[PDB]
Amino acid sequence: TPVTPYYGPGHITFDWCGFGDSRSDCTNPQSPMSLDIPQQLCPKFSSKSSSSMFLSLHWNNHSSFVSYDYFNCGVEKVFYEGVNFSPRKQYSCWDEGVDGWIELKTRFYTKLYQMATTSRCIKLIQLQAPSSLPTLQAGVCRTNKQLPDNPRLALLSDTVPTSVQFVLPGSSGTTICTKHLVPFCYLNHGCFTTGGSCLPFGVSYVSDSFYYGYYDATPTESHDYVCDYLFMEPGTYNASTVGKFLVYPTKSYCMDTMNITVPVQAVQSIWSEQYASDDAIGQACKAPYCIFYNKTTPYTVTNGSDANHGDDEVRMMMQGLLRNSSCISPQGSTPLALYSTEMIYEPNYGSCPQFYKLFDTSGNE
Amino acid sequence: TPVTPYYGPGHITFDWCGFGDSRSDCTNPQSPMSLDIPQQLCPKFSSKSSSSMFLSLHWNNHSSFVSYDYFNCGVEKVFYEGVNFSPRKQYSCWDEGVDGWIELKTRFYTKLYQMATTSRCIKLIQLQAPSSLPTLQAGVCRTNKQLPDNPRLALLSDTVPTSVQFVLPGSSGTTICTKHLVPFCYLNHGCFTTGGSCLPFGVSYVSDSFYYGYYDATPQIGSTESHDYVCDYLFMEPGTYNASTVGKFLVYPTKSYCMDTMNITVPVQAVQSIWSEQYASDDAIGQACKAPYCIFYNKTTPYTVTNGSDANHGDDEVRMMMQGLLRNSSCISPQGSTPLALYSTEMIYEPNYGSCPQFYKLFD
Ligand SMILES: *[C@@H]1O[C@H](CO)[C@@H](O[C@@H]2O[C@H](CO)[C@@H](O[C@@H]3O[C@H](CO)[C@@H](O)[C@H](O)[C@@H]3O)[C@H](O)[C@H]2NC(C)=O)[C@H](O)[C@H]1NC(C)=O
Ligand SMILES: *[C@@H]1O[C@H](CO)[C@@H](O[C@@H]2O[C@H](CO)[C@@H](O[C@@H]3O[C@H](CO)[C@@H](O)[C@H](O)[C@@H]3O)[C@H](O)[C@H]2NC(C)=O)[C@H](O)[C@H]1NC(C)=O
Ligand SMILES: *[C@@H]1O[C@H](CO)[C@@H](O[C@@H]2O[C@H](CO)[C@@H](O)[C@H](O)[C@H]2NC(C)=O)[C@H](O)[C@H]1NC(C)=O
Ligand SMILES: *[C@@H]1O[C@H](CO)[C@@H](O[C@@H]2O[C@H](CO)[C@@H](O)[C@H](O)[C@H]2NC(C)=O)[C@H](O)[C@H]1NC(C)=O
Ligand SMILES: *[C@@H]1O[C@H](CO)[C@@H](O[C@@H]2O[C@H](CO)[C@@H](O)[C@H](O)[C@H]2NC(C)=O)[C@H](O)[C@H]1NC(C)=O
Numbered sequence: 045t046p047v048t049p050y051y052g053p054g055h056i057t058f059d060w061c062g063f064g065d066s067r068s069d070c071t072n073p074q075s076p077m078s079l080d081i082p083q084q085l086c087p088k089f090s091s092k093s094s095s096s097m098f099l100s101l102h103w104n105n106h107s108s109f110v111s112y113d114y115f116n117c118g119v120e121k122v123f124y125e126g127v128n129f130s131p132r133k134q135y136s137c138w139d140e141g142v143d144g145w146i147e148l149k150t151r152f153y154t155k156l157y158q159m160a161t162t163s164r165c166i167k168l169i170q171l172q173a174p175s176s177l178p179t180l181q182a183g184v185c186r187t188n189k190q191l192p193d194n195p196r197l198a199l200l201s202d203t204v205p206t207s208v209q210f211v212l213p214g215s216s217g218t219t220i221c222t223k224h225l226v227p228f229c230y231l232n233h234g235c236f237t238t239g240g241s242c243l244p245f246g247v248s249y250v251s252d253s254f255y256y257g258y259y260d261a262t263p264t265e266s267h268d269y270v271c272d273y274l275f276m277e278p279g280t281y282n283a284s285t286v287g288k289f290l291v292y293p294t295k296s297y298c299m300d301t302m303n304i305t306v307p308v309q310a311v312q313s314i315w316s317e318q319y320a321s322d323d324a325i326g327q328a329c330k331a332p333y334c335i336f337y338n339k340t341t342p343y344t345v346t347n348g349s350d351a352n353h354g355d356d357e358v359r360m361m362m363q364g365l366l367r368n369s370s371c372i373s374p375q376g377s378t379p380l381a382l383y384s385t386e387m388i389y390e391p392n393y394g395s396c397p398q399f400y401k402l403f404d405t406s407g408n409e
Numbered sequence: 410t411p412v413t414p415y416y417g418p419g420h421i422t423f424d425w426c427g428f429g430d431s432r433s434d435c436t437n438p439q440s441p442m443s444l445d446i447p448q449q450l451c452p453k454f455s456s457k458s459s460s461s462m463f464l465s466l467h468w469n470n471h472s473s474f475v476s477y478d479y480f481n482c483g484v485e486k487v488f489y490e491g492v493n494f495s496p497r498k499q500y501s502c503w504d505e506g507v508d509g510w511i512e513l514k515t516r517f518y519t520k521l522y523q524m525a526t527t528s529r530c531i532k533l534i535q536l537q538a539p540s541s542l543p544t545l546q547a548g549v550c551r552t553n554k555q556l557p558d559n560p561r562l563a564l565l566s567d568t569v570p571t572s573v574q575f576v577l578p579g580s581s582g583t584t585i586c587t588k589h590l591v592p593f594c595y596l597n598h599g600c601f602t603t604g605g606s607c608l609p610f611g612v613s614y615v616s617d618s619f620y621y622g623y624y625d626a627t628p629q630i631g632s633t634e635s636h637d638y639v640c641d642y643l644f645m646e647p648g649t650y651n652a653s654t655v656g657k658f659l660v661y662p663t664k665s666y667c668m669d670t671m672n673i674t675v676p677v678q679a680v681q682s683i684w685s686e687q688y689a690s691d692d693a694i695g696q697a698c699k700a701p702y703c704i705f706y707n708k709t710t711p712y713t714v715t716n717g718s719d720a721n722h723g724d725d726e727v728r729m730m731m732q733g734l735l736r737n738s739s740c741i742s743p744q745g746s747t748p749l750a751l752y753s754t755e756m757i758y759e760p761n762y763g764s765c766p767q768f769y770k771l772f773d
């Protein structure tokens with residue numbers, strides 16, 4: 045019989061998982077009023093109030109940073125977080141401004157979703173400190189906001205070219221790490237004046253089979269904190285420097301491999317209209333790796349815990365996760381059928397119905 | 410009644426193109442005996458006997474390098490080339506060995522296929538020589554084989570930092586370049602001894618809105634100095650950029666693949682491109698052509714000629730696959746193409762596009 049896509053995420057198999065924030069955290073004291081998902085799906089989500097996967101990559105816990113050890117496994121994946129690092133927060137570190145950090149956010153989610161499509165498990169781990177570390181002075185932000193804890197940015201007591209060794213583990217607990225999502229960051233725009241001269245800023249991650257680096261010795265002194273998010277295989281690497289500045293990772297997303305490529309799903313994660321949101325999720329979640337379900341309405345709560353918890357639109361969307369589905373698409377989900385009442389676009393997966401009008405024998409069409 | 414996918418590449422509309430080599434080059438004097446495609450599809454292909462897209466990016470014409478100004482447009486795209494840069498050629502430049510270049514080949518096709526999925530036109534273009542070049546001495550391979558023409562590797566007379574400007578144009582003829590595939594290459598593994606000392610190897614492409622670079626001054630141990638010629642294949646927007654160096658060594662690009670933009674993403678199709686088993690082939694095409702961006706049609710038989718021009722032209726299996734391009738299909742998949750149908754005799758896997766029949770057993 046004919047079917048119509050149900051707008052919202054969905055799952056075809058039992059092997060699915062969710063990543064989220066307060067709006068899918070049943071440990072929140074206001075739950076179930078504070079949920080945007082059905083309460084019975086809380087055990088399917090790895091979620092924590094006030095956190096995000098981006099924020100938790102870069103920061104451990106501080107007064108304005110709620111860091112969570114995100115961890116979940118599923119062939120099919122539903123992401124519903126991101127809001128807790130938004131322009132509302134007004135975070136910046138050096139001269140990059142808030143827009144700089146919305147760009148970094150977009151880069152991170154782009155890579156996260158990409159890597160997630162060939163993984164089943166995704167787990168944020170704390171890396172061990174390099175075994176040998178010289179005397180180090182912690183870096184700071186020009187803004188006096190909290191410097192990211194990952195990657196570590198620190199200052200050596202001399203200008204001697206140096207390497208320390210870091211380990212991306214092959215496993216963490218029961219999870220296999222066939223790959224790691226690792227940030228590589230640096231301060232750009234020329235040499236950096238400290239310890240009596242304008243020192244080249246040159247750092248790199250290196251092994252026999254890997255190189256990624258930045259170098260600038262070129263002559264207001266301005267710098268931006270910039271990051272790239274790297275696919276790195278398990279192994280031991282050098283965090284190398286041409287001198288003074290040292291950057292090495294302290295956390296990573298450990299992922300395993302599955303031998304199928306399944307697009308992930310992300311729902312728009314924003315604040316009510318009185319606060320400043322971004323579209324990093326929409327810009328990051330693109331074909332062919334990610335199926336983006338945008339909101340068509342503002343974040344609007346009529347029967348929830350406060351103005352930013354219990355959106356009617358997203359609640360209706362998340363009902364899709366309770367449905368019988370064999371096809372997942374940006375139009376939503378359908379059970380197994382021959383014909384769809386509307387056109388189904390990409391990315392999609394499963395066994396999908398074909399657009400009804402293509403088979404019409406009227407022929408009015 | 411369920412339909413069976415026809416194994417081989419295909420197309421849903423007229424707006425498709427091919428990229429190829431001798432096996433789809435009707436100008437070859439042995440044509441059509443030397444073709445693996447139907448003769449009547451030669452006009453849909455941009456192809457040159459003895460060339461490949463990877464080779465042509467890095468080299469112009471030299472004794473054993475046939476370079477071709479590849480150029481074609483299509484929403485759908487069939488790639489059947491690659492073999493003319495394989496281990497049979499025994500090419501290497503620095504200490505990276507033959508396998509080092511098979512790796513670079515793989516990186517290039519991977520990037521090519523990815524970028525191609527959101528482009529219609531792909532055009533290999535020559536870049537303008539930078540203005541006000543300093544005095545430069547040509548680089549050389551340690552193997553004394555032919556140094557890539559692209560990017561240019563050259564030696565300045567001094568060791569002080571400097572920069573030259575290169576332009577990636579916004580258009581070439583009537584093709585719009587919304588982006589460029591540009592190689593960035595360097596000699597790795599520590600400082601490089603020239604001019605009587607071991608100098609840092611530090612090069613970069615930089616603009617107000619772009620940075621990619623490499624730097625190493627690690628001292629060498631004993632007499633073990635070794636370097637590999639390494640490349641990364643970069644997505645770069647049209648604009649002016651600096652090719653910068655910390656001194657001595659200069660790297661700047663001299664060619665790129667100019668591509669435009671279409672607002673749908675469509676996977677490309679690659680057919681396995683190999684030699685007869687008299688010669689060494691590689692699997693760079695198969696390793697580069699991956700879901701979700703490329704649909705790989707591998708060969709299940711060796712390259713096997715029964716009615717062609719020589720052992721390496723007229724493979725029966727690929728000839729059968731290329732018959733698929735003679736229909737307008739509705740569904741394109743790794744199992745091959747189908748017309749519009751309710752049911753398929755077998756599971757249709759990813760990547761696929763169009764309107765695809767469903768495996769009949771699902772409905773009983
Ligand atoms: C950042 O700090 C918070 C605390 O402010 C850490 O959250 C805490 O995590 C622990 C262990 O994961 C939770 O304890 C557990 O609670 C359950 C009940 O659900 C209990 O049965 C377990 O045996 C255990 O005690 C704790 O509830 C949780 N607290 C809060 C307020 O969330 C968080 O782990 C820290 N993040 C990082 C990256 O270290
Ligand atoms: C490298 O050297 C070869 C010569 O050995 C160059 O091949 C020549 O390229 C031109 C332009 O692609 C060919 O002309 C074309 O002929 C066809 C068919 O007649 C015509 O329909 C096209 O419009 C075009 O005029 C020419 O035939 C071809 N010559 C040979 C002997 O194959 C090649 O271009 C050089 N490569 C580079 C990068 O300069
Ligand atoms: C997700 O939906 C939002 C809201 O419709 C889109 O944001 C709008 O974008 C248009 C086009 O620039 C603006 O004129 C509107 O004012 C935006 N509205 C708001 C409230 O910001 C957003 O572009 C969508 N994202 C994607 C990837 O489709
Ligand atoms: C999920 O939905 C599919 C499609 O509606 C169900 O499959 C149908 O089940 C009925 C029995 O109620 C059969 O008569 C039909 O032939 C089935 N249709 C197809 C296309 O297979 C399926 O039973 C549902 N699954 C669950 C667990 O409810
Ligand atoms: C495409 O097909 C060829 C031939 O089957 C595959 O190459 C074989 O790969 C197996 C597994 O590694 C090796 O044991 C054989 O020695 C290879 N045979 C030949 C003739 O090369 C190749 O792996 C395939 N590529 C992909 C991406 O599927």
Ligand SMILES: *[C@@H]1O[C@H](CO)[C@@H](O)[C@H](O)[C@H]1NC(C)=O
Binds near residue numbers: 250251252280282627
């Ligand atoms: C790090 O650098 C040292 C010395 O430069 C080198 O010998 C060592 O192998 C490197 N370690 C790794 C894991 O690449």
Ligand SMILES: *[C@@H]1O[C@H](CO)[C@@H](O)[C@H](O)[C@H]1NC(C)=O
Binds near residue numbers: 076077347
């Ligand atoms: C509001 O939500 C509560 C608790 O989640 C529920 O019991 C109640 O029926 C809802 N009221 C309306 C009007 O939907």
Ligand SMILES: *[C@@H]1O[C@H](CO)[C@@H](O)[C@H](O)[C@H]1NC(C)=O
Binds near residue numbers: 734736
């Ligand atoms: C396919 O359709 C196009 C577009 O209308 C048509 O012009 C062309 O003749 C057809 N090509 C083939 C190979 O049937």
